[PDB]
Each structure stands twice: as C-alpha cells, then as structure tokens.
Design an enzyme around this catalytic site. Structure first.
Site, PDB file in Angstrom:
ATOM      1  N   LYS A 179       0.956  -1.002  -0.468  1.00 29.00           N
ATOM      2  CA  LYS A 179       0.047   0.553  -0.028  1.00 29.00           C
ATOM      3  C   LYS A 179       0.819   1.096   0.109  1.00 29.00           C
ATOM      4  O   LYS A 179       1.026   1.625   1.470  1.00 29.00           O
ATOM      5  CB  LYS A 179      -0.765   0.158   1.201  1.00 29.00           C
ATOM      6  CG  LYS A 179      -2.045   0.643   0.797  1.00 29.00           C
ATOM      7  CD  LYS A 179      -2.538   2.326  -0.028  1.00 29.00           C
ATOM      8  CE  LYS A 179      -2.032   2.739   1.738  1.00 29.00           C
ATOM      9  NZ  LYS A 179      -2.368   4.505   1.437  1.00 29.00           N
ATOM     10  N   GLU A 254       8.920   1.652  11.505  1.00 32.26           N
ATOM     11  CA  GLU A 254       9.921   2.917  11.244  1.00 32.26           C
ATOM     12  C   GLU A 254       9.249   4.493  11.149  1.00 32.26           C
ATOM     13  O   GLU A 254       8.578   4.715  10.152  1.00 32.26           O
ATOM     14  CB  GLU A 254      10.542   2.849   9.716  1.00 32.26           C
ATOM     15  CG  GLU A 254      10.762   3.966   8.967  1.00 32.26           C
ATOM     16  CD  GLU A 254      12.274   4.881   9.701  1.00 32.26           C
ATOM     17  OE1 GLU A 254      13.234   3.809   9.955  1.00 32.26           O
ATOM     18  OE2 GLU A 254      13.001   5.378   8.021  1.00 32.26           O
ATOM     19  N   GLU A 387       9.032  17.341  14.102  1.00 33.28           N
ATOM     20  CA  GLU A 387       9.417  16.417  13.324  1.00 33.28           C
ATOM     21  C   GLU A 387       8.985  17.992  12.222  1.00 33.28           C
ATOM     22  O   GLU A 387       7.394  17.384  12.304  1.00 33.28           O
ATOM     23  CB  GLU A 387       9.277  15.400  12.735  1.00 33.28           C
ATOM     24  CG  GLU A 387       9.325  14.580  11.417  1.00 33.28           C
ATOM     25  CD  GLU A 387       9.641  13.712  11.200  1.00 33.28           C
ATOM     26  OE1 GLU A 387      10.703  12.243  11.230  1.00 33.28           O
ATOM     27  OE2 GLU A 387       8.256  13.433  10.888  1.00 33.28           O
TER      28      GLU A 387
END
Ligand SMILES: NC(=O)c1ccc[n+]([C@@H]2O[C@H](COP(=O)([O-])OP(=O)(O)OC[C@H]3O[C@@H](n4cnc5c(N)ncnc54)[C@H](O)[C@@H]3O)[C@@H](O)[C@H]2O)c1
Ligand SMILES: NC(=O)c1ccc[n+]([C@@H]2O[C@H](COP(=O)([O-])OP(=O)(O)OC[C@H]3O[C@@H](n4cnc5c(N)ncnc54)[C@H](O)[C@@H]3O)[C@@H](O)[C@H]2O)c1
Ligand code: NA
Ligand code: NA
Lengths: 496, 496
Positions: A179, A254, A387
């Site tokens: 995906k 991750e 981030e």
C-alpha cells in the site's frame, strides 16, 4: 492508465473511485490513481493467502531460495532497463530532483540483487544445528516465512521504500500486499507491470493503492495478514499497532525522527558544512532520519553557521527535471502549508529565521520553500521538538561534550544521529552515548543496504536492510528430536 | 512475609494493601503478598531508570558483560544452595508436584549460568564489521541494552518464567521490573533477597507484586518503560500490546496454544503413550505448549487410546508434597471451574469422556481434576478450538498424511506441535508443514535453554531462550563512518 495489481493482473476497484495526482512543481493535475476500498483489499489478501497455500502447485513459501532469487534478479534487470524513465516518473510523482531519483533507482536495483543473493544463501542456512547438554536429544532450527505481509510505505522514497520491504519479504518466501502513499503511487504501480513482464507467480505481490484510512486501514485490520511492516508518521504507526493488537500480530515500525548532528571544534568547517546541509535539505528535507537539530561547539558556532547560510543560498531551486536542480518542491499543498506553519510558529516563539523561510521569488507556482536555517532556538520551542519534513534546520550551541550529548538526546525520538570531529576517540565515545538506531561519524544520511536500519524510542522498532531486513520476514522454528530408544520414565507404567 | 523490592530495598506499598494467598490443595488462606499500586510502580520504574543512567552506566548497563556475568553466577549459586527450600515454596504456591518444582529449580540455576556465559561473550560481539562496497565508508554494529524492561510473568512456572526473562535481560545490561502473577509470587519475592545478599546494584531488578489490572496495567502503560515482555493469556496479551501502542513500545508475547500431537502407525505404542500423557497432563495440564489435541491414525487408534486411559488412570494424584505425586490441584477456584465447564461443554456438544472428567473421590477438598481424555470430537467443538489449561486431552482420528497436517494446522494458535513416527523422512516432512514455533519429533514438551522458544500466529511473536532470548533485550545500533578526505561533492561550494 494503471489499475490495482491483484492476483497477477490488473483489476479496477469495485467502487471505481479515483484520486487526483498533483505535480508538486506546477500544481497541475498530472493524472490519477485507483482508490481501493475494503473489498478490493479483501481480494488482495486472499490472493496472497492462495499464493502461499500448500495446495498451490507453485507454492511460493515452499520454493527453494534460489528459485525466488531468479525472480528477484529478473525484477532487478527489468528495472535497470527502465532506469531513466522510472527516475523521471519518480521526480514528477514526489518532487525530488532527477539526480536523487536516478540514484534511488540504482539502489532499488542493488536492493533486489542483494536480497536475491540472500535468498540463494538461505537454503544453506536451513537446519542450522543447536548444541545440547544431552545426547538423548538432537535440535536444529528452520527459518520460515512469516506468511502474508502488509507493506505500508511513505512517499519520500516511493519506489525505494517499497523495495526495502518487498525484496526481503519475497526473498524470505512471503506473499506481499503493498500500500504505497496516495501522494506518490506511480512507480510502485509500474512494479506491477514488471512483475507481469517477469512472470512473478500470481498473488506473490499485490499492489493496492488508495487512501490511508480506506485501503491502508482495511489492509492493517484484515485477519489473514500475518505481519505489518510500516513506515510513516508516529500517529499512524500507533494506530496501526493498535489495530495489530486486536489479533495480536507482529509489527515493524519506522516512524519520524528529530535527529541531532553534533559538530565539535576540531573540524574542517567547509567539508562538514556540506554534510550538515545534506543531512537536513536533501530530499527537500523529507527524510525520516534527517539531521534537523544542529548542535555546534560555541567556539566555531557563528562562523560555521554563516558558512551553512552561504551553502544553502547557493542551492539551486527549480523544477526537478531541470539540469543542476539540488532542491525540488514539497510533495503536496497540505505538506507545504505544514512546513510554512512550522517556520511561522518558530518566528512567533521568538526564534531567528537566519535564511530562507519563504517561497523563492523566481518561482511563482509550485510548493517551493527556500532552505531554512533557524537560530536563537530554545529547547522548549516547537521547532526543537517537532519533526518538520521540510528543508528547515534548527541550530543550538554547546560549551561541553556532556551538554552536547544531553542536547542530542533531548527528544522522544531515536532514529538517526551524527558526530563530526577529527578526534576519532571522541567520535567513538559519542556513538555510544547517542540514543539512536543509526550513528553517522563525519557524515550524515548514507544508508547502505548491507547495514541494519531502524530506530529506538518513539522512532519505532525493528530493523530493515542487511540480514536484519530478511529476518523481519522470517520466524524461527525449533525442531527438537528425541534420538534415544529409552522410555521417558516420568509416569508410572500401568501393568501390561 | 516480604514486601516490594524497589531500588535494592524492601518497601511497603504506599497504599499498604495486601493480597491473600490460597493453597490450591487445601483451599485455605496460607499467607499474603504485597499489593503494589500505580504509585509503587512509578517508584520501581524510576529506580530502574536511575540504575541505567547512574555513573554513565558504568556500574551496570555500560559495563562489560563479564561484570554482569559475575552477578548472574553469584545469583545462580545462591538459588542452588536453597533449591530444596525454593522447590517446597514453589509447590505450595502454584500447586505443581514437588518433583516438578524441584526440576524447575535445576532449570532456573542452569538458565542463570547459561546467560552468564552469553554475558561474557557479548563484549567480543561488539563492533562486528559490516562489509561495504565502498572504500570511503566503514561500518560496524553495537549491541546495546534496550534500557528499562517490564517483565510480566505467569503462575504456571512461577520462578522459571521469571528467570527466562530476567537472566537474559540482566546479561544484556537492562534494568528490569518484574510483575509476577498474583497467584504465585512467593519464589520471585525470595529472588529479591538473593539480589540483596549478592549485592546487585540498586534498581537493576525491581519486584512489584499485585493485581494485574492495578500493578500490571500501571507497569505496561508507564512512559519510561522501554520494552514489555509478556507471557500469559491472549486477552491480556492483546491489552498489553494496545497499551504499548500508545507510545509505540516494542513487545514480545508468548500466549496460549492448542498444540497438536500427531501419532502415526509406525510407532512403539507404550513409549508414545507416555509422551502423549506427559504432553497434556504435566504441570497439571497448565502448559502453554500443552499438546492437547491428539491426532491418531485410525488403524492404531483403538488400542493406542486404550493405553492412554491405562496410563492416565495410573497417574498418582495427591497433595503436591506427597512422595509419589504425579498430578497436583488446579492453581485456583476460578480456573478450576473453567476447566470443569470445558468438560461439560464437551458433553453439551456430544463428545465422549473416556476417563476422568471429575473430582477424584479420595481428595474431597482442593482444586483437583482427574486426567481427562475425551473422544468423538468435532472440528467445530469448543474443546477442539479453545485452550482448557487443565489436564484435558481431545482426540480426533486420521487416515492420510494430508488429513493429518490439515487437522494439526486447524487452529488460530501456533506455539507447539509433536510428530510421532519411526519414519524420520515423514517426521521431517511434517515438521515443515506444521505451523508452530516448536516442533517435537518423537517426544513432547522439553524446553532446552539453548534452543529458541516462542509462537507464531495467535500464540504470539518474539523468541526466548538461546541467543534469541538475549537478542530480545538488545537493540542494534549501526555505526557508519566516512573515512575519506574528499569533500562529499553533492552540492556546489559557495566560493572561494
Ligand atoms: N517521518 C516519516 O517517517 C514519514 C514518512 C512519510 C509520511 N509521513 C507523514 O505523512 C503525513 C500525511 O498524513 P497521515 O499519514 O498522518 O494521515 P493521512 O493523511 O494518510 O490520513 C488522515 C487520517 O487517516 C488516518 N490513517 C492514515 N492511514 C491509516 C491506516 N493505515 N490505518 C488507520 N488510520 C490511518 C490518520 O491517522 C489520520 O487521522 C504527513 O504529515 C507526513 O509527515 C511521515
Ligand atoms: N495460556 C497462557 O499462556 C496463560 C498463562 C498464565 C495464565 N493464563 C490465564 O490467566 C487467566 C486469569 O485471568 P487474567 O490474566 O485473564 O485477568 P486477571 O485476573 O489478571 O485480571 C482481570 C482483568 O484485568 C485485565 N488485566 C490483567 N492484567 C492486565 C494488564 N497488565 N494490563 C491491562 N489489563 C490487564 C484482564 O484483561 C481482565 O479483564 C486465566 O484465564 C488463564 O487462562 C494463561
Ligand atoms: Na504526486
Ligand atoms: Na498461590
């Protein structure tokens, strides 16, 4: 145009919905991709289940590693042929400069070749003996594929991230459902045609494109998926793990990062200036392990940061296909606005926008941001904490090594990190102290496929690449045999 | 009468509550354990955090493996001294026959000794080179402790299960918080005193006893816990993983099973009868990997199952401390009722009880059940699908090999499995087809510390024992250095 790749051919989504695909540098609709839903996903998983089920004559999980290796090598060679065209599609799709995309393609090729090699070696590794304290027992282990695997990948390295998971998954004997991200789906769909052209057995790789909350969620929660391998945002990874918890399935994650780069004084300012700019601006700053927090020794701080400013302002910003492009546009409008909001918030919180921080004057359209360096950063600022996923670097200064490491570890993340100093004794000390999965010494960002890659803490868990990447898709089976001919002698025997 | 073991000291729970302790063979209150609450769990995790960061980790976590090895060996020696004492306590606490508990303690000692060896070997495994196809880069791996670990352990092998988790966790350099089961906490609390006598650095091992929903839940959800390792029920396993998902903490889960034992015709009937009865009735049938589904070949089924009855009825059932004891009582009332309801449910669906299925007439008190073997079982029945966790064997019949593996694999679990036949070529074929983490050939239930133990599918994931046990508590760090003097050369220098 392409549809969903299911069971070895092209299938139109049952509900026939489609998602607009935007060119980041022009802002124009360049095409579209199929929007898969729950029942499209159901077909993919069944095909994968069938690809590996015993009563299949071409049983992928029961095949020898060298046979799977032949498919992997063929997939690699076909990709090598289309290198230049796939790289061009990659650039248009996600917005990275052409030279970056072409490099990614080389890595894709190497990645399949590498795991092809590991697939060949895997047969030799089977039945590895275990030494026991008794002579009455013998023991070995088998390395079996985990089964059906859901592979959910990000848009920053569309084709390479997909490859990082599919090559080891297939090499291990797994059947995969991929995906990719709705923002960059084109090259992964091209991998479906390649699988057709190379005759990959039906159902071994299935490619389901669409919205994260439709296709991705359906895939993640399907009861017949044995393992989910994920790369993306912290929040989605958390949801994915929550979903996996329902049926107690293993997961590899991750997630984002906020990686530090620690620059000491005994350094070639110019050489390390390129590395620190690279660690933060490369891939338009859309790197999971981006070294976005600079931690510079106070004694060289101001002259080092000034060098950074000049390097960054000399970075050519243009359409990704134009010769000499060193910075492309942000992947999407929503992402562009988030990146601009981060710069805005930093300004609001009292930090200095030393360079960049705005749309470049020579480009009226497209999601372009000038490389941004931010100083007068305080540890409680959003810019230090969160981030960005844009070409935005936050700078802090230090006076002692102890302070440097405490600043470096001042994050709930733990993906990458870098140390820059000529004193190698100091580097080794810092590589041990930095709480991260990756530590670069005297560079920032290189990922070789021979070396394990992953994070600790809120950056997730599990390792991709190298032999760790293969293991991610294997389970260990203990085969223990009773060699003796003696009765076990625990219970009382009856009478006869 | 002990307390909580926190930061190397005995401390009364902040809220001063205690949990009664029942003897399973008499139903009388025989003592009590401290009931830790959220506030105590915070103190234990805090102490663990301090134990890893104290003095740059030089006392434990960043120390060499040989330092930790000495402690593990010292702990081993202490256990070995008091093995008969701890065995007696273990039987009273969990209800297993004394000779089983005594055997557990031998395994506890050997488990600490084994991981002591791996601790010494760990220093030589540091900085293992990674071969790169470039001159300019060099790469190696560090194997670091994962940090602060939550160890949640079951009541069936109270001391041994704790050991399976703590021994490799300590060898790795971790600081651990143990949450034993509230039904069997006594020997684990004794381990606290052993750490005191041995002078184990404070905070390296903490022991928090209490209710699963208070102490267990508070431990699992603590933000400063780096990893949770859990053995117990599916439901709780699932809840642990959901909690971990909020902060994306890695987990390892060993859950229940419904393990098959497949018995072919080419077999010594008396020898495999012993094994089958051992596979299902040992530890009072409270084995995670209990082989509780018998799958016999129709030709031998009638006389093989008759021998099973003979053996089962010759199993000596009594107080766990009596001389010949071969079956003790079920751990508690709640479990006892669940086991008896499982047998009733079998009758409800039309299955036949061939022996047992009731209170033994001689015991009167205590949570005792006769070794039960049931037949005329269907694929759709509850006794075929669900884990009983009592001495209850279900029996189906087969004729062909394809029929055998399909019945064996007819479960959402996947922990253990056992093949019985003299044809070793056949045993090997089955060991490849059986979906389990452990395959036994011509035996059932031995677990060597050298060999990896764990499940697939809904039995969980992750591996304990062997070097796999150690790896469960280590995280891989990649250290990559740029050795060249040449500038990176990606960006254009700003002159001059
Ligand atoms: N740092 C990285 O590793 C990395 C890499 C690629 C993308 N990203 C992030 O991708 C983000 C784009 O938005 P998004 O991915 O957070 O959400 P999204 O835009 O894909 O979807 C919006 C909603 O759907 C939910 N959702 C998405 N996939 C799901 C799934 N598989 N299962 C259950 N729910 C799901 C999200 O939680 C959110 O509430 C960007 O903010 C970017 O930072 C991060
Ligand atoms: N098969 C195995 O591996 C194994 C081993 C040991 C015990 N067990 C099981 O132990 C069970 C006894 O009850 P129990 O353990 O299901 O619940 P429990 O008696 O410990 O507590 C009752 C409630 O608290 C919840 N809970 C317990 N610990 C929790 C935690 N750490 N975090 C969040 N919620 C938690 C449970 O889900 C349940 O709803 C028996 O049914 C037995 O089958 C299974
Ligand atoms: Na796009
Ligand atoms: Na007890």
């Amino acid at each position: 145009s392409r549809q969903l790749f299911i069971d070895g051919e092209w299938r139109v989504p049952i509900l026939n919905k489609r998602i607009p695909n935007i060119n980041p540098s022009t802002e124009n609709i360049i095409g579209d991709i199929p929007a898969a839903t729950k029942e499209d996903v159901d077909l993919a998983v069944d095909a994968a289940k069938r690809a590996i089920s015993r009563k299949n004559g071409r049983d992928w999980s029961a095949a020898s590693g060298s046979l799977r290796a032949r498919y992997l090598r063929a997939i690699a060679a076909k990709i090598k042929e289309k290198k230049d065209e796939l790289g061009k599609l990659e650039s248009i799709d996600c917005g990275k400069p052409l030279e970056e995309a072409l490099a990614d393609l080389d890595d894709v090729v190497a990645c399949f070749e590498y795991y092809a090699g590991l697939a060949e070696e895997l047969d030799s590794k089977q039945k590895a003996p275990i030494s026991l304290p008794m002579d009455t027992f013998k023991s070995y282990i088998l390395k079996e594929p985990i089964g059906v695997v859901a592979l959910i990948t990000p848009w920053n390295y569309p084709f390479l991230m997909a490859t990082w998971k599919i090559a080891p998954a297939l090499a291990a004997g797994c059947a995969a459902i991929l995906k990719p991200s709705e923002l960059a789906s084109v090259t992964c769909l091209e991998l479906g045609e390649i699988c057709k052209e190379v005759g990959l057995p039906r159902g071994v790789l299935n490619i389901v494109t669409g919205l994260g909350h439709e296709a991705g969620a359906s895939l993640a929660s399907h009861p017949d998926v044995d393992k989910i391998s994920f790369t993306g945002s912290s929040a989605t990874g958390s949801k994915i793990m929550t979903t996996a918890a329902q049926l107690v399935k293993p997961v590899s994650l991750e997630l984002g990062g906020k990686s530090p780069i620690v620059v000491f004084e005994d350094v070639d300012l110019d050489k390390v200036a390129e590395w620190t700019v690279f660690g933060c601006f490369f891939t338009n700053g859309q790197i999971c392990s981006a070294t976005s927090r600079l931690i510079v020794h106070e004694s060289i701080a101001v002259e080092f940061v000034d060098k950074l400013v000049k390097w960054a302002e000399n970075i050519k910003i243009s359409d990704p296909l134009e010769e000499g492009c060193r910075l492309g546009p942000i992947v999407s409008e929503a992402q562009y606005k988030k990146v601009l909001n981060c710069i805005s918030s930093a300004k609001s919180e009292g930090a200095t926008i030393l360079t960049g921080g705005r749309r470049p004057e020579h480009l009226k359209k497209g999601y372009f941001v000038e490389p941004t360096i931010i100083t007068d950063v305080t540890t409680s600022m959003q810019i230090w904490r969160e981030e960005v996923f844009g070409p935005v670097l936050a700078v802090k200064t230090f006076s002692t090594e102890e302070e440097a490491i405490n600043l470096a570890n001042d994050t709930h993340y733990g993906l990458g990190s870098a140390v820059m100093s000529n004193d190698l004794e100091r580097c080794e000390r810092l590589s041990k102290a930095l709480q991260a999965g990756i530590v670069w010494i005297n560079c920032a960002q290189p990922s070789f496929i021979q070396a394990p890659w992953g994070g600790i803490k809120r950056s997730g868990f599990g390792r991709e690449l190298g032999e760790w990447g293969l293991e991610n898709y294997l389970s260990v089976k203990q085969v223990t045999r009773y060699t003796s001919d003696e009765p076990w002698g625990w219970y009382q025997p009856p009478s006869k």
